């Protein structure tokens, strides 16, 4: 009779613990499966966040390394006030990354490519036919540092060689 209890309680053990615990690991370890993918890709982009600790909490600590390299310089022992490159070099390499925001926007190169450190604004001015007062075609307004690109980017969806109503800012009125 205890062997009958082995058939009942132990068929419940193998059959019911295997099938019921098969539901526990099937559904619940399916939640651990998809949630394991969640913490998996979260671990990957978390390692990209650790890369951002190198890409920002070390890169701006490289900016801080130049900063306390200049307070570490402290070479007055007033004309050593050029303590930044990122006053020129990374500031016109950041503003030459506005020649890469320019060169991306193109946004000269096309053939001016001189000085848009602050390529200071862009707008969406659908232009007007100035005589009749009706509308003209649309135009991106590319107000660079010292030259204007009133460019009809239609149907020039780039922003590579768009219609450049252009001049220099020093006599733009």
């Amino acid at each position: 009779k205890f062997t009958s209890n082995l058939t009942d309680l132990s068929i419940q053990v193998q059959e019911e613990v295997k099938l019921n615990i098969n539901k526990s690991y099937n559904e619940i370890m399916t939640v651990n499966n998809d949630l394991n993918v969640a913490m998996l890709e979260l671990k990957r982009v978390r390692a990209n966040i650790n890369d951002l600790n190198e890409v920002l909490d070390q890169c701006t600590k490289i900016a801080e390394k130049r900063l306390q390299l200049q307070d570490q310089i402290d070479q007055e022992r007033m004309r050593r006030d050029r303590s930044s490159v990122l006053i020129l070099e990374k500031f016109w390499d950041t503003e030459l990354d506005q020649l890469f925001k320019n060169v991306e926007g193109a946004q000269k190169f096309i053939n001016s490519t001189k000085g848009r450190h602050i390529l200071m604004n862009s707008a969406n001015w659908m232009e007007l036919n100035t005589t009749t007062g009706k509308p003209l075609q649309m135009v991106q307004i590319f107000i660079l540092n010292d030259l204007v690109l009133i460019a009809d980017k239609s149907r020039d969806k780039q922003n590579d060689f768009i219609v450049s109503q252009c001049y220099p800012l020093k006599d733009v009125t």
Binding site: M29, N36, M39, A47, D57, Q58, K61, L67, Q68
Partner: protein, 182 residues
């Protein structure tokens, strides 16, 4: 004068000084970051370790049974289209053309070595075509005829029929359903 140079003194000196101190403390923070990340994925070895257990004989049983009712279709006699969808559920909704007409053509495409050669794949694709025509009337009933169903009856019943594609035939059944007045 030294108001401006006082901005150079406090701002430059304190900015450089607490820039190095706060950024170095931030480097200690990044040390705790990779610490917890290393202990995290190191604790996440049991994830993959348990995750090898995806015993896809379930896939061999839905696939073996897919071969089975596929052969029920492939007797040219798969009349198991419970009417006609089956109604309100065949996967969760109308799936007589979803799991089966795509198995009428894709299991018409299921060539083992010879396996009921292209005499059978054509008329099996004509079961994909009859169930495709009733599928067109089905999602047409879902969204083109209703056309009053702001609920899932247009939305998640044709989108329950979103294993079938080509919804600009349904927009064709919007210039023939909703712009039919137009």
């Amino acid at each position: 004068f030294s108001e401006q140079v006082a901005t150079q003194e406090v701002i430059h000196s304190e900015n450089v000084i607490k820039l190095s101190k706060d950024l170095h403390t931030t480097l200690l923070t990044f040390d705790k970051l990779d610490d917890r990340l290393t202990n995290v994925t190191q604790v996440v070895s049991p994830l993959g370790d348990k995750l090898e257990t995806a015993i896809k004989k379930k896939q061999n049983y839905i696939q073996s049974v897919e071969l089975i009712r596929r052969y029920n279709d492939f007797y040219s006699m798969g009349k198991s289209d419970i009417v006609e969808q089956l109604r309100l559920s065949k996967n969760w909704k109308l799936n007589l053309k979803s799991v089966k007409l795509m198995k009428n053509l894709l299991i018409l495409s299921s060539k083992l070595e010879t396996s009921s050669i292209p005499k059978t794949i054509n008329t099996k694709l004509v079961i994909e075509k009859y169930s495709e025509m009733m599928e067109n009337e089905l999602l047409e009933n879902f969204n083109s005829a209703y056309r009053e169903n702001n609920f899932t009856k247009l939305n998640e019943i044709a989108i329950i029929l979103n294993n079938f594609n080509g919804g600009v035939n349904v927009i064709q059944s919007f210039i023939n359903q909703h712009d039919y007045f137009i």
